[PDB]
RNA sequence: GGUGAAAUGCGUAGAUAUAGGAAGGAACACCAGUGGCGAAGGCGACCACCUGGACUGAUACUGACACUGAGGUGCGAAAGCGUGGGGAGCAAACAGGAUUAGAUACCCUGGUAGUCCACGCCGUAAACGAUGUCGACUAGCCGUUGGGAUCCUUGAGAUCUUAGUGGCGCAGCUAACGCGAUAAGUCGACCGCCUGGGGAGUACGGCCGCAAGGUUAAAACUCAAAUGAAUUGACGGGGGCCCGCACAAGCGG
């Protein structure tokens, strides 16, 4: 159940992430899946190259999607996207906040 | 270094003396420290 | 195996409501878990380390039935007529 | 308390200068928290919040 | 040409010592090996011959400028630290040495142990 | 200018090589720990999904449902074996190149099987803790892993309690070495096994395997021994200390 999705997007595409996330929220709410936390971090600088970039845009979110809601959410960057690296990280509960 | 392949029988031979030189370090020096 | 499956297999095998431990309930909790694990080993056939946890459930059920059959065949015939055994 | 891949101010205290995780014989850390440390390192390391090698 | 700063490698194997001077555009200027100074055979996989080999990298790099250099060292053999003191003596005020020795994270398996 | 010492791939084809890119397999540094998990064989990157067992805390339930186990039936490192992918690296075979009376080898440069993946087979190892499984009891001290509880409590912690994993050691046992709450002590239940050394885990038979072969398993004949552990010595191309014109300063066939 409870997951903790954190995904990068390519920094040149940093202006539709407000739509990206939004689309991911409405796709999770369509099975009633709650969203306990949603944080957009900065356009942080990576510690190494990912596909020869050096800067990327971090988004973290905490989700209670059922099973197929995750699978379509994971396929919204598995089949294709311009989002890179992400870990879905099954958790056990809801949360509060980070980014100092 | 990592020059040759260490067959994992001879690589699973560890602990040279670390339960002597770090465990009996406070034992064999107790002829003076009492 | 689940929390609410395992509470409901208790619930129709109860025999004096506080009970969860009679060889009725235990054979029913085992037989359900054996059947649901048969889906796993058609899909995961190389998993031998979890077959052994299943064969333990088969043998733990066979000992409990041999216990109950030697002790009260009227409870044995009713349990074996449920659960689709023998 | 339960240390986490987001908390980089805690994770950088057990990362050596070359990027490597420091053992439990150097820092005084319990064996449960060390093996919980070297998972939050390896998640932040994967997620490019921390390098693998010193170089970049 | 005249380039004022460059990055300068030392390949420091057990057999030989290769020193290559480049720029930060990585393109090789002057290479000098520990057997290219007339050694050829057994003897000097030693810090002696890298002291001989690192200076020939120097006075052939003193054609296109190159005052300050950055030293990349790569390899386990002697002549590792006696090629970076044989390098400031040719009139270089090198910034900092840097170690780049390739380490696998588990990698290929190595060859058999010599008997 | 590898090393106990040199020999193969290179320049009207650019030579170890760039600050660069792409592909592909295969293994997952650091963490790493007399650490952990698993019946054993085994299992090391990270995330998800599917799943097994343990540990642990109280409470409720069943009421001897238990222990072991000849047969049997599963699972078993490696290497081998079919059948099909794969193929970096490494590399039985084998080619050379050395080294030596020779070198059929140890060293070098290569390198196909194999290693890797899928399904099927084999069913063996110094498969070892050379120690069957289960249960009960018998001085202590020092670590450590997973829990729990008490402790003025800050824990920098401390104590008892459990289930593991180690180091010493009393009683006891042991031929000795040694084992010593993880017994090789004290007892109990059941099983497997052994009966001098060779012959020999071999023939013949049976069963199994596609094969390689495995498993069950002898006799003739032969010898007075093999064998264990400790002791003194001698010895070592074992180690550590020590000495002497032993090592080289201003001698001479």
PDB file of C-alpha atoms in Angstrom, chain A residues 31-66:
ATOM      1  CA  UNK A  31      -9.041   4.633  -7.366  1.00  0.00           C
ATOM      2  CA  UNK A  32      -9.519   6.712  -4.239  1.00  0.00           C
ATOM      3  CA  UNK A  33      -5.803   6.507  -3.483  1.00  0.00           C
ATOM      4  CA  UNK A  34      -4.871   9.122  -0.913  1.00  0.00           C
ATOM      5  CA  UNK A  35      -1.857  11.419  -1.295  1.00  0.00           C
ATOM      6  CA  UNK A  36      -0.306  12.093   2.080  1.00  0.00           C
ATOM      7  CA  UNK A  37       2.562  14.349   1.032  1.00  0.00           C
ATOM      8  CA  UNK A  38       3.667  16.192  -2.080  1.00  0.00           C
ATOM      9  CA  UNK A  39       6.909  18.148  -2.139  1.00  0.00           C
ATOM     10  CA  UNK A  40       8.722  19.781  -5.016  1.00  0.00           C
ATOM     11  CA  UNK A  41      12.353  20.341  -4.194  1.00  0.00           C
ATOM     12  CA  UNK A  42      14.608  22.714  -6.068  1.00  0.00           C
ATOM     13  CA  UNK A  43      16.363  22.292  -9.353  1.00  0.00           C
ATOM     14  CA  UNK A  44      19.191  20.594  -7.522  1.00  0.00           C
ATOM     15  CA  UNK A  45      22.617  19.790  -8.890  1.00  0.00           C
ATOM     16  CA  UNK A  46      23.252  16.065  -9.267  1.00  0.00           C
ATOM     17  CA  UNK A  47      26.340  14.486  -7.744  1.00  0.00           C
ATOM     18  CA  UNK A  48      27.180  12.756 -11.051  1.00  0.00           C
ATOM     19  CA  UNK A  49      25.912  12.663 -14.613  1.00  0.00           C
ATOM     20  CA  UNK A  50      22.620  11.023 -15.547  1.00  0.00           C
ATOM     21  CA  UNK A  51      22.402  10.740 -19.363  1.00  0.00           C
ATOM     22  CA  UNK A  52      25.008  13.542 -19.447  1.00  0.00           C
ATOM     23  CA  UNK A  53      23.078  16.137 -17.480  1.00  0.00           C
ATOM     24  CA  UNK A  54      24.332  17.807 -14.321  1.00  0.00           C
ATOM     25  CA  UNK A  55      21.241  19.545 -12.951  1.00  0.00           C
ATOM     26  CA  UNK A  56      17.809  18.040 -12.388  1.00  0.00           C
ATOM     27  CA  UNK A  57      14.422  18.739 -10.834  1.00  0.00           C
ATOM     28  CA  UNK A  58      13.378  16.663  -7.815  1.00  0.00           C
ATOM     29  CA  UNK A  59       9.791  15.834  -6.864  1.00  0.00           C
ATOM     30  CA  UNK A  60       8.861  13.694  -3.866  1.00  0.00           C
ATOM     31  CA  UNK A  61       5.414  12.361  -3.055  1.00  0.00           C
ATOM     32  CA  UNK A  62       3.792   9.939  -0.592  1.00  0.00           C
ATOM     33  CA  UNK A  63       0.979   7.870  -2.015  1.00  0.00           C
ATOM     34  CA  UNK A  64      -1.502   5.202  -0.871  1.00  0.00           C
ATOM     35  CA  UNK A  65      -2.430   3.845  -4.343  1.00  0.00           C
ATOM     36  CA  UNK A  66      -4.011   0.408  -4.676  1.00  0.00           C
TER      37      UNK A  66
END
